[PDB]
């Protein structure tokens, strides 16, 4: 992609494109699909400890940003472009998991219901770290609670996964640029 011609494309998005358009490995796309489906299954049944143990690497950065709305033509205003809805290391994810599992988390009674839909999976090995797997996928996340509360989340996920303990591929980075600026879902208290 030439971003001088394709005026709406960001440098970052163009770079991420290039990663997948090149060396397509069908076996890798299938491995990635399995990895992500199993991860989503664990999250959906609220097996958060199992998710940490089986899916999340010790060196993880788990990040979801909200980007301030700026003019397409803006080039003077330079201040912090985004805030971090999430920007978690492993210990910080563990804190959030303990908060979910705490019997005095009143908001979790009656039990929440989660359903995740993972689509558009792409996978490509890193060029320089032959053990680093880039995985892109999109998620629709449906959360239902308390009779008539229904919140639906939509996002693209840029992941890096790497073989860890026992040769199990685990998430070492997730980056989401959340597409809705003002949330209409009460909160973003879900693991995208």
């Amino acid at each position: 992609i030439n971003i001088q011609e394709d005026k709406l494309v960001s440098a970052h998005d163009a770079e991420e494109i290039l990663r997948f358009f090149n060396c397509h490995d069908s076996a890798l796309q299938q491995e990635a699909t399995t990895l992500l489906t199993q991860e989503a299954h664990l999250l959906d049944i609220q097996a958060y400890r199992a998710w940490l143990e089986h899916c999340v690497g010790s060196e993880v950065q788990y990040q979801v940003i909200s980007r301030e709305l700026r003019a397409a033509s803006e080039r003077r205003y330079k201040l912090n472009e985004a805030m971090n809805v999430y920007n978690e290391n492993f210990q910080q994810l563990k804190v959030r998991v303990e908060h979910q599992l705490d019997p005095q988390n009143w908001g979790n009674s009656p039990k929440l219901r989660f359903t995740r839909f993972i689509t558009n999976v792409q996978a490509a090995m890193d060029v320089n770290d032959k053990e680093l797997l880039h995985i892109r996928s999109n998620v629709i996340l449906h959360r239902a609670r308390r009779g008539n509360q229904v919140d639906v989340f939509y996002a693209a996920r840029e992941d890096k996964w790497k073989r860890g303990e026992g040769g199990v591929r685990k998430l070492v980075q997730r980056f989401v640029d959340y597409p809705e600026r003002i949330l209409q879902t009460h909160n973003l208290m879900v693991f995208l």
Partner: protein, 446 residues
Amino acid sequence: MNYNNKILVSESGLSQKHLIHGDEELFQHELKTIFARNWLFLTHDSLIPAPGDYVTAKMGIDEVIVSRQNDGSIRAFLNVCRHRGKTLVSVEAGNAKGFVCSYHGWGFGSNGELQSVPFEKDLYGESLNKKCLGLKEVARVESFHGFIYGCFDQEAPPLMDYLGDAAWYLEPMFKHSGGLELVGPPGKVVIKANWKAPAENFVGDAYHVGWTHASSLRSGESIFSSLAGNAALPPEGAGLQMTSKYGSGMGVLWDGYSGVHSADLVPELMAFGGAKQERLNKEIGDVRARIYRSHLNCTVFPNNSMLTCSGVFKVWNPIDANTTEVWTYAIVEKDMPEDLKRRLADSVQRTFGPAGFWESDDNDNMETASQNGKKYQSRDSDLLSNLGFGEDVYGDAVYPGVVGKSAIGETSYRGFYRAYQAHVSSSNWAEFEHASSTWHTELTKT
């Protein structure tokens, strides 16, 4: 409903009718008597530091453009074109010398003036009086140590006087610390609660912390963590509560400088705050230097709240009686190391932002308390705020305002709702003043 006569808040602020969280007619009335009358938070110097920098902000349900002028001042204008009413600015922040309307191309300056009209000569000739067509300007814009507030009512007290006795408590952190910066952009989330539910909670609610936030206290290991599940009561002398004439109030939890931050920040913060306190002792005295490094949960009336030391800064933007748009920024001390500021900002959002696990504990409480105010059998019911009544003082030799000398109570609820009722039943600032000439006596009765 007759707002001159209806007792929505009982004497001394002891109770409020539950309908205040649900009634849409009253919400509409609040647009006039609360939001068009009082000081509302806009932005910080740190977010619009250079000439031409601007942000958009809500003031009640209205949207304004807040712009740094060439002379260093700040002016704010309705985000509405003077021709046929189109929204001028569609972004949240930027830098520009003016704003052009996407409908018919009228161009307004950063100073609000109508500067250009396409083909003016051929179309309007000399007949368009552009001098009378500037953007509708916010009458009053003032700063409290970099924090910029606006008011549509020219008759309002100056911002400093409006803060009343609350200013004394804020100054150690807002002024004597060397100054704060607001870290943007804010998180933005809609909750199904009345704006008053989080406003009242931040102004005066320490009682809820151990129970509502049991899980966050147990899980995060913060310094107020002994409270989890009401396992322990903060000891005698652990803090105080205060309120003021114009409705602002706060709780003070002595020494709680690391606030809600998880153990990962506790040693660093407790070292930093203590070191600055030691310097401040010589400058502002021991008590005020201690206040600097004490956790303040404050609402600046009506709808701006904060937790100092934790660094949480909130705007509860009203949408309707059961809908509020929550803006969350971080506040940091300017002279903190940059890496600490960055981590503090992330921690503010981690705990109280859109996915803030502490703030999530409050959701059902605020939403259901608000929504119940619409339910038929609850409209005329009484919400209670009598905890600590009869033990408040005024004019104390050390701590100013109406003060409850205990960490947990409802002193600040009473002062908040006393001011609220005085505004709702008044047509202008002069009537509010008349309704408030014995404000502290009313709050310290019995």
